Amino acid sequence: ASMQKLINSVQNYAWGSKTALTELYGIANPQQQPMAELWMGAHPKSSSRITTANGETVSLRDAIEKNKTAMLGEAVANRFGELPFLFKVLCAAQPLSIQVQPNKRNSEIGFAKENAAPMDAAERNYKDPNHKPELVFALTPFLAMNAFREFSDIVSLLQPVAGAHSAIAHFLQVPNAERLSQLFASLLNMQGEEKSRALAVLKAALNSQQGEPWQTIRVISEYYPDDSGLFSPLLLNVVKLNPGEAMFLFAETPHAYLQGVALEVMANSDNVLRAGLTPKYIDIPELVANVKFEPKPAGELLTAPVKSGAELDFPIPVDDFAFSLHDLALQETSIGQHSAAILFCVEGEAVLRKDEQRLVLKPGESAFIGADESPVNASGTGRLARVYNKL
């Protein structure tokens, strides 16, 4: 088959929505399980599968291993040696942890620092030496946090909780990167009476303070009542993405997914440094060494796409992946790339054609197109999301 309909894995993590994938796409869930992530790719823990001329399904990862140049293209093959991204539908029924991704050089350093002394333990920050760029694209209204607010923005939000902790008063007297870093670390490091004081003062402020981000803190607090993370909407931008909007998650920058359904594209790494809204241990010094305490203004948070014909590209400052949306109509458009691609039906209904082969995708279904099989022609109605490499 020139085009391969994907059989995909759904991770049933405890935080997933019991309904989102069913409401959006008709995906069955009779056991009423939490369906947290739908994986499109070649991850070894749970690769997508494809069907052979034969009738057998095979791992997409194994099929790529067997024919890398043909499937990935020479460029991706020689640079990555594998499908360099994982593509997901994320369906957060509750807020998730704050995270930070180290950049490439520090991932390499950290990965070698740690090898020299316990793989799947919980002081293991670097499970690998790859970086982890990500893009999120909203499928329903998507509440997230991303990056530090402008300092005057933080100063204004902290005033009502100045008495919460002395690190707050400290930042207020001189609101700079250094004191923001001390504040961030002190908040995460709070214990016992120090922490309960800080949390008591924050909970009370929620009665005197209306609107955002206070409202966001209320939402988080239903799931994380004793977490120092509750201060983070006062330091970090809270953003509500409308469906069709995207944000690229830069390295060294805190972020969190709080509510709603999105597509996510990432490079392949299981590194994560957590920075709150988690019960796990956090290595605060390592976290701090990997955060850029530089404000990001709200106007620069969303990725500005570029529209050319039926294609809306989302420019990504990283090589690991690219991402585009394709408006479908009756007349075919050619969708071609020098890499492997995964095409995913966001809404409507797509007919892919490659010569005589016709493959129909309904919303939520996806197909893999090997490098040797580009281009394919698309028609129908709605939109197709495409993940690929521009290299």
UniProtKB/Swiss-Prot annotation:
InterPro entries: Man6P_Isoase-1, Mannose-6-P_Isomerase, MPI_cupin_dom, Pmannose_isomerase-type1_CS, PMI_typeI_cat, PMI_typeI_hel, RmlC-like_jellyroll, RmlC_Cupin_sf
Active site (catalytic residues): R274
Binding residues for Zn(2+): Q99, Q101, E134, H255
Broad class of the protein's primary localization: cytoplasm
Biological process terms in GO annotation: carbohydrate metabolic process; GDP-mannose biosynthetic process
Catalytic class of the enzyme: isomerase
Molecular-function annotations in GO: mannose-6-phosphate isomerase activity; zinc ion binding
Function: Involved in the conversion of glucose to GDP-L-fucose, which can be converted to L-fucose, a capsular polysaccharide.
NCBIfam families, per database record: manA, PRK15131.1
Name of the protein: Mannose-6-phosphate isomerase
Lineage, highest ranks first: Bacteria, Pseudomonadati, Pseudomonadota, Gammaproteobacteria, Enterobacterales
Gene from which the chain derives: manA
